[PDB]
Ligand binder design. Structure first.
Ligand code: CL
Ligand code: MG
Ligand code: MG
Ligand code: MG
Ligand code: MG
Lengths: 194, 194
């Protein structure tokens, strides 16, 4: 029933553009929307990946590995799943493993890979693959792991027990003034709700 | 250690603007970022998303989701019920209102998150995630009346909580919808729990 009629560029930066989107509503009326898009997306099945990294070690509770960074759009520090854009030609799985290692030092093993899922679909076309990766924390590769952050990347690693994730995120928010990512919070809620 | 120095307006529409953010990286180097913001924020957050747990006796517990055409995505998306918080509305009340408008269900607040970010690499947009239970055996939720505003066209989809990830994957595989990243993250954690 509904579909896009035209997309009109309003403003284009190096990384983000704003478009006037005209579409057909289900009554048969023409309407518009303001849409955000990235300029970086090519033939990738999605803009980016986010990694759910489950750190497993013998006689330890499983942990979820998270990153804390300054996010200029937010004006502040945010706690998120490790994440980055997919390079041209790169698979979502390779991007996930690469970004995890760059942001945390860990070398993971793929567990599963989502289809492309939308980040904020009332606002943008941005999509990611959510890639679940296990980290063998007993392997010596993953013993004293060093982040290899790229240029202008400054990442702190925070590993929290899966079995207490939501309370541990609450405590961090309580003691520190940072924002938790909505996907991280959702995942922590579902762990409680199960 | 990092902070915002200034923001330059690049382009403002009715609903959304694009800014160039100047910030100090942790080395003492000045850097720029292209950031998106909504023009609608007043508010604890821009928006609420509702995790609606439909509880009916002798039935599987369901998570109630909505399907709508999203102009920026150019396609249909499956999402938690959600919308912008009215200036001077509480997040809890926005949640019950949105849930009622989009689904017709009348529910009860279980918990409310702090403000969480939607896509902090791109935008400053934030939401409260509001877990709501719906007593599906109460007369007011018998034939639920969805009261959508102007230009909202919403299909309601209830899926069993204990198989949610498999059910969503099926809908993507067969219906060519995009699942929201927060919905997918919640679904994953339901599987990952224990
Ligand atoms: Cl619940
Ligand atoms: Mg990153
Ligand atoms: Mg990165
Ligand atoms: Mg809505
Ligand atoms: Mg609404």
């Amino acid at each position: 029933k509904q579909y896009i009629i035209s997309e009109e560029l309003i403003s284009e930066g190096k990384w983000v553009k704003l478009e006037k989107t005209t579409y057909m509503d289900p009554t048969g009326k023409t309407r518009t929307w303001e849409s955000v898009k990235r300029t970086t997306r090519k033939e990738q099945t999605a803009d980016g990946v986010a990694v759910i990294p489950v750190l497993q070690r013998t006689l330890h509770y499983e942990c979820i590995v998270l990153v804390k960074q300054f996010r200029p759009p937010m004006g502040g520090y945010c706690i998120e799943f490790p994440a980055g854009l997919i390079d041209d030609g790169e698979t979502p799985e390779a991007a996930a493993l690469r970004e995890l290692e760059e942001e945390t030092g860990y070398k993971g093993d793929i567990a599963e890979c989502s289809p492309a899922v939308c980040m904020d679909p009332g606002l943008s076309n941005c999509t990611i693959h959510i890639v679940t990766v296990t980290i063998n924390g007993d392997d010596a590769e993953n013993a004293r792991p060093k982040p290899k952050p790229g240029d202008g990347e400054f990442v702190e690693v925070i590993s929290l027990p899966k079995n207490d994730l939501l309370q541990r995120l609450d405590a961090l928010v309580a003691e520190e003034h940072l924002t938790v990512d909505a996907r991280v919070y959702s995942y922590a809620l579902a762990l409680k709700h199960a």
